Amino acid sequence: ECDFTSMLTAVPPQVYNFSRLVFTNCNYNLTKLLSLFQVTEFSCHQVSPDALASGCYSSLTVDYFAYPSYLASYLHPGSTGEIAQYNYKQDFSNPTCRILATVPANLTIPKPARYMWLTQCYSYSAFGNTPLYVKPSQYTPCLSLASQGFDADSQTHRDTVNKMAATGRIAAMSGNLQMAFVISVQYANSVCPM
Amino acid sequence: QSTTEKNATIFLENFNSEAEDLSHESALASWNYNTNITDENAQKMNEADSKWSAFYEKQSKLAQTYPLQEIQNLTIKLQLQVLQQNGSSVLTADKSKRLSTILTTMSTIYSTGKVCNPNNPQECLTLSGLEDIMEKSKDYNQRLWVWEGWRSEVGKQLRPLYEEYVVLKNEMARGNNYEDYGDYWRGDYETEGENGYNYSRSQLTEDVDRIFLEIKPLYEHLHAYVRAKLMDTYPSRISPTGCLPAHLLGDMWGRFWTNLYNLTVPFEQKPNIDVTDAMKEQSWDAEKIFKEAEKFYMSVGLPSMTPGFWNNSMLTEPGDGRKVVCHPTAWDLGKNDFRIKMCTKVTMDDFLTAHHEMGHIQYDMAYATQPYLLRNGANEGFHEAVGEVMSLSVATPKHLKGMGLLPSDFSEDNETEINFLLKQALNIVGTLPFTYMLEKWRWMVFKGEIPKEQWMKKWWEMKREIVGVVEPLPHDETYCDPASLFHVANDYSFIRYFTRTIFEFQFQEALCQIAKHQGPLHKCDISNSTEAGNKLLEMLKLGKSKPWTFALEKITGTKKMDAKPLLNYFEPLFTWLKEQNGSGNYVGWSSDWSPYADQSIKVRWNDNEMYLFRSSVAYAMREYFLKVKNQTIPFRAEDVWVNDVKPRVSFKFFVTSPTNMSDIIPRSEVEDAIRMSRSRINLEFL
Numbered sequence: 006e007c008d009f010t011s012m013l014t015a016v017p018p019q020v021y022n023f024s025r026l027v028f029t030n031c032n033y034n035l036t037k038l039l040s041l042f043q044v045t046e047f048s049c050h051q052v053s054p055d056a057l058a059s060g061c062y063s064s065l066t067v068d069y070f071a072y073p074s075y076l077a078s079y080l081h082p083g084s085t086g087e088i089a090q091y092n093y094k095q096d097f098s099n100p101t102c103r104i105l106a107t108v109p110a111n112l113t114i115p116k117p118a119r120y121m122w123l124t125q126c127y128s129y130s131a132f133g134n135t136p137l138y139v140k141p142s143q144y145t146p147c148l149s150l151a152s153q154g155f156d157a158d159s160q161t162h163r164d165t166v167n168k169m170a171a172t173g174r175i176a177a178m179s180g181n182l183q184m185a186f187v188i189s190v191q192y193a194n195s196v197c198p199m
Numbered sequence: 200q201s202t203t204e205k206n207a208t209i210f211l212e213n214f215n216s217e218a219e220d221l222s223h224e225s226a227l228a229s230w231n232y233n234t235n236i237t238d239e240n241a242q243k244m245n246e247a248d249s250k251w252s253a254f255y256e257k258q259s260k261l262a263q264t265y266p267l268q269e270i271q272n273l274t275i276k277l278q279l280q281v282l283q284q285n286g287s288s289v290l291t292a293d294k295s296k297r298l299s300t301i302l303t304t305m306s307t308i309y310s311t312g313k314v315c316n317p318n319n320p321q322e323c324l325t326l327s328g329l330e331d332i333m334e335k336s337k338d339y340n341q342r343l344w345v346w347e348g349w350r351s352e353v354g355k356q357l358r359p360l361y362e363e364y365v366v367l368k369n370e371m372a373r374g375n376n377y378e379d380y381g382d383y384w385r386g387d388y389e390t391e392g393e394n395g396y397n398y399s400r401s402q403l404t405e406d407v408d409r410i411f412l413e414i415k416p417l418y419e420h421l422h423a424y425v426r427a428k429l430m431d432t433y434p435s436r437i438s439p440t441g442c443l444p445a446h447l448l449g450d451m452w453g454r455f456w457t458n459l460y461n462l463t464v465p466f467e468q469k470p471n472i473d474v475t476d477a478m479k480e481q482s483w484d485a486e487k488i489f490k491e492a493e494k495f496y497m498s499v500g501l502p503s504m505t506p507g508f509w510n511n512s513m514l515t516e517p518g519d520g521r522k523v524v525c526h527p528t529a530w531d532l533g534k535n536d537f538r539i540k541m542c543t544k545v546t547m548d549d550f551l552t553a554h555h556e557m558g559h560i561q562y563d564m565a566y567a568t569q570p571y572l573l574r575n576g577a578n579e580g581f582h583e584a585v586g587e588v589m590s591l592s593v594a595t596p597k598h599l600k601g602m603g604l605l606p607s608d609f610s611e612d613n614e615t616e617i618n619f620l621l622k623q624a625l626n627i628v629g630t631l632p633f634t635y636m637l638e639k640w641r642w643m644v645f646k647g648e649i650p651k652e653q654w655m656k657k658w659w660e661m662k663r664e665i666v667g668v669v670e671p672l673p674h675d676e677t678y679c680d681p682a683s684l685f686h687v688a689n690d691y692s693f694i695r696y697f698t699r700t701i702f703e704f705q706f707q708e709a710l711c712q713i714a715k716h717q718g719p720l721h722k723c724d725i726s727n728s729t730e731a732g733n734k735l736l737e738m739l740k741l742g743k744s745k746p747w748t749f750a751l752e753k754i755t756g757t758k759k760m761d762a763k764p765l766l767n768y769f770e771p772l773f774t775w776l777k778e779q780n781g782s783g784n785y786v787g788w789s790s791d792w793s794p795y796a797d798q799s800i801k802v803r804w805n806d807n808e809m810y811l812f813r814s815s816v817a818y819a820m821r822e823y824f825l826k827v828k829n830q831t832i833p834f835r836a837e838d839v840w841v842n843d844v845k846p847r848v849s850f851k852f853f854v855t856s857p858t859n860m861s862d863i864i865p866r867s868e869v870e871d872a873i874r875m876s877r878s879r880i881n882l883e884f885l
């Protein structure tokens with residue numbers, strides 16, 4: 006009886022501010038959760054697409070955010086790009102699946118203005134910059150700075166007290182909304198399918 | 200942590216924060232104009248440059264309040280040195296304004312220079328069309344009127360402008376506590392250090408002098424093999440023991456010898472590796488060329504490109520109607536923004552250019568965590584050297600075979616390797632004596648070791664003895680032959696091309712040892728070696744925050760410039776050249792022969808006596824060809840060339856034909872014509 010409504014009735018967050026659903030003591034239907042969208046990727050890791058819904062788990066976690074599909078390659082945690090460096094590092098300590106989807110024009114998910122993500126996050130001094138890297142399954146230390154948003158490319162917000170800075174990039178919200186889901190389960194008869 | 204240092208630290212932390220924003224705006228405006236050339240875009244660029252210049256000048260005046268002797272931190276001290284440079288503000292308002300007018304006149308004269316044919320006045324040529332002649336023609340007379348034409352029109356205008364340039368630049372350099380403007384340029388290599396890491400400005404002249412004498416035995420054997428080949432193309436125009444005529448070297452200045460390859464190829468039957476047809480048979484676009492370069496850098500352990508690299512670069516020539524000038528460049532806009540501007544065709548030359556440009560991007564991404572002012576190469580030669588090293592490895596048949604661009608059964612024969620190494624030396628070894636002599640000349644002009652009454656006298660003495668090149672016609676002090684080159688008329692330092700070559704082969708040899716290569720260096724490929732790319736990356740991260748001798752030791756394990764790595768790379772060719780020249784070819788040159796020396800007449804008193812003497816000779820020729828040859832030839836005082844002038848009145852001269860400067864009138868006929876008019880001319884003739 007796991008609920009996915011809070012995932013569908015509000016505007017989705019950006020990649021650096023991902024939302025998290027942890028389901029305990031409920032029964033799920035992953036087929037019903039996805040048939041609503043247009044899955045265009047399902048790369049998994051120490052699990053498989055057919056075994057993802059089959060199993061019974063100690064706990065289940067879902068992270069989700071708005072994400073352009075043309076940045077699909079950078080969402081792998083083993084990348085040296087900005088998405089894994091500053092926005093979202095996926096934890097390979099547990100079986101995880103990565104789902105990229107498209108929101109059909111029938112689904113009434115509110116859209117955001119644009120896609121946003123960080124290209125830099127560092128502490129500054131007269132001796133140079135020190136990059137601040139996001140930890141697996143955690144949040145960037147530049148979240149407080151990034152919360153305000155970015156309206157242009159290469160726009161910087163500085164925190165003059167702690168001496169931190171963050172730089173963002175944007176992409177136009179063209180056509181239907183696109184999102185990304187990262188599902189990680191743990192091992193145990195609490196969480197089961199029907 | 201003195202109050203001064205504490206105060207200077209707060210000052211440098213506010214400047215770095217504000218310079219990141221303004222630099223990005225200025226560079227974004229400059230990119231929008233260069234990829235889309237319009238008048239509207241040309242004003243947005245100038246508005247942003249004005250904002251940067253206002254900010255930087257105000258910050259340089261604030262920086263002058265922190266004395267350097269009170270700063271114990273080297274990172275703080277290096278940033279303040281950059282900001283405290285005064286430049287041309289040490290001159291008065293009139294003198295500063297005059298120096299900017301001279302610099303604009305000299306670059307305008309160069310770029311609008313136009314020469315044309317003494318035998319066909321209606322067809323005249325600019326530099327683009329004159330360089331096509333010098334790079335293709337095998338006609339002696341055509342190459343000579345193009346060579347002498349460029350010097351005679353362009354070079355004779357810049358001589359008065361260059362004499363004022365030298366005086367003004369020495370006043371500026373002395374106002375910044377240098378001996379002269381050459382001492383000022385040599386400060387690009389000066390560093391301070393504690394344990395042998397210091398390097399003075401006088402050390403650079405000594406090191407450059409010592410390396411040149413080590414590469415000269417190899418340059419002499421290449422000079423001897425090229426001279427004997429040029430003697431078949433131009434029979435009776437070249438002495439087997441003397442210098443090479445300056446107008447026959449394959450370009451306008453003799454900087455590179457690469458266009459002499461068709462004349463000197465060791466084995467013409469065997470062709471050279473070219474994979475352009477393999478890229479077209481597999482339908483490569485320009486995107487796939489840059490996707491292969493990214494795979495190369497990732498194979499040695501270097502990062503990938505940012506997402507914005509692919510969306511923001513200009514990798515092909517646009518077809519939307521935008522006007523651009525195609526010249527490959529890598530751009531570091533700041534704020535994690537890297538772009539390449541390139542017009543890419545599916546050829547092998549563009550495949551190698553892509554690897555070179557992506558090497559510059561990899562260096563910039565490495566020192567992006569340095570303070571803004573230290574974000575540079577260690578010296579002016581490290582940046583280009585890094586790009587060249589990467590291109591050496593990817594041009595190897597071993598690398599191309601692994602890419603599928605060469606047949607799986609491809610075998611390499613030693614005659615194709617000699618063809619490959621000769622073509623490399625026509626570029627790399629041919630230009631080293633050229634670069635050294637020009638810097639040696641400029642440095643002596645700024646010192647005053649050469650007075651301005653002997654500028655062209657010393658220029659051709661040095662050409663004959665350092666380069667082994669002789670002028671086809673004698674040039675007096677109304678010429679300025681150095682200034683006919685782009686870098687001299689545009690006020691660019693030139694010794695970076697010497698150092699880059701030396702560092703590139705030092706870097707290459709270190710990395711092939713780490714990659715565990717067996718065999719000759721020229722066959723080495725560092726691809727798939729993460730231990731070699733990690734050793735390169737520790738030097739690249741430093742930027743300009745350390746002495747360049749310390750960054751050199753990081754990768755090569757030595758603190759000094761060294762030419763033995765260059766001589767190891769060209770060792771298979773040096774062995775083959777000694778068998779070729781060993782009756783073979785004389786090795787070395789004599790500074791006595793010239794294309795005009797055997798027809799001169801020695802005459803054993805100011806400049807108005809010359810103009811009268813040349814007209815007396817010109818009249819005597821014109822009458823002799825009418826009363827004996829029954830010809831009307833309009834000889835002028837411009838057809839009489841005075842050379843080899845001594846303080847005591849003793850000079851030589853010869854006559855050329857009024858339309859054909861290649862045709863020197865024989866010494867026998869000139870003597871007879873003087874005897875006929877000996878009465879009117881009057882003077883011992885030897």
Ligand SMILES: *[C@@H]1O[C@H](CO)[C@@H](O[C@@H]2O[C@H](CO)[C@@H](O)[C@H](O)[C@H]2NC(C)=O)[C@H](O)[C@H]1NC(C)=O
Binds near residue numbers: 239240
């Ligand atoms: C090439 O440059 C022209 C000239 O600036 C650009 O045209 C202008 O575009 C801006 C949009 O930022 C408009 O506000 C102006 O009215 C346009 N002016 C003209 C004369 O066209 C053009 O957009 C640029 N092209 C590209 C592909 O960037």
Ligand SMILES: *[C@@H]1O[C@H](CO)[C@@H](O[C@@H]2O[C@H](CO)[C@@H](O)[C@H](O)[C@H]2NC(C)=O)[C@H](O)[C@H]1NC(C)=O
Binds near residue numbers: 075176177179510
């Ligand atoms: C950056 O370049 C990519 C090319 O990889 C663009 O991706 C295309 O986006 C459109 C619309 O979203 C799709 O129809 C194409 O299929 C995408 N191409 C590929 C190869 O996937 C992307 O739109 C560009 N981004 C910007 C802001 O210009």
Ligand SMILES: *[C@@H]1O[C@H](CO)[C@@H](O[C@@H]2O[C@H](CO)[C@@H](O)[C@H](O)[C@H]2NC(C)=O)[C@H](O)[C@H]1NC(C)=O
Binds near residue numbers: 597601
């Ligand atoms: C670097 O190593 C990779 C493998 O780690 C090489 O890739 C293989 O190359 C062979 C031929 O050399 C091909 O038959 C394989 O299909 C390639 N495999 C993959 C996964 O690409 C690569 O060739 C090496 N590069 C160089 C320059 O030697």
Ligand SMILES: *[C@@H]1O[C@H](CO)[C@@H](O[C@@H]2O[C@H](CO)[C@@H](O)[C@H](O)[C@H]2NC(C)=O)[C@H](O)[C@H]1NC(C)=O
Binds near residue numbers: 613614617775
């Ligand atoms: C390529 O290698 C062959 C060896 O097979 C060389 O041929 C020898 O050349 C030397 C020249 O000193 C002769 O003394 C030998 O008699 C040759 N041997 C044979 C079997 O031909 C050839 O010279 C090499 N080519 C180059 C350009 O170095």
Ligand SMILES: *[C@@H]1O[C@H](CO)[C@@H](O)[C@H](O)[C@H]1NC(C)=O
Binds near residue numbers: 036
């Ligand atoms: C899971 O949801 C799908 C979606 O409609 C549905 O067809 C299926 O019957 C559900 N599974 C079970 C066991 O009810």
Ligand SMILES: *[C@@H]1O[C@H](CO)[C@@H](O)[C@H](O)[C@H]1NC(C)=O
Binds near residue numbers: 017018024148152153
């Ligand atoms: C993260 O997103 C949620 C909405 O999903 C929003 O309420 C919250 O303020 C965001 N936090 C930020 C922007 O720091």
Ligand SMILES: *[C@@H]1O[C@H](CO)[C@@H](O)[C@H](O)[C@H]1NC(C)=O
Binds near residue numbers: 202203206
């Ligand atoms: C440092 O700055 C403060 C504030 O402007 C000033 O009072 C102080 O004298 C400065 N110290 C030095 C040594 O410049």
Ligand SMILES: *[C@@H]1O[C@H](CO)[C@@H](O)[C@H](O)[C@H]1NC(C)=O
Binds near residue numbers: 272273
């Ligand atoms: C210079 O400052 C840096 C950064 O605080 C420090 O690591 C280094 O020890 C300092 N060096 C000296 C000589 O004070």
Ligand SMILES: *[C@@H]1O[C@H](CO)[C@@H](O)[C@H](O)[C@H]1NC(C)=O
Binds near residue numbers: 263284375
């Ligand atoms: C720059 O010029 C000013 C003005 O006289 C002078 O005080 C200062 O010492 C100069 N800077 C250097 C580094 O010599």
Ligand SMILES: *[C@@H]1O[C@H](CO)[C@@H](O)[C@H](O)[C@H]1NC(C)=O
Binds near residue numbers: 398402
């Ligand atoms: C470094 O300084 C020492 C002593 O001042 C000097 O002997 C040495 O020649 C210098 N090194 C260079 C490369 O100039």
Ligand SMILES: *[C@@H]1O[C@H](CO)[C@@H](O)[C@H](O)[C@H]1NC(C)=O
Binds near residue numbers: 334335458459461
């Ligand atoms: C050399 O020969 C090739 C092939 O004939 C030709 O394309 C090229 O233009 C020649 N180069 C020169 C400088 O003559």
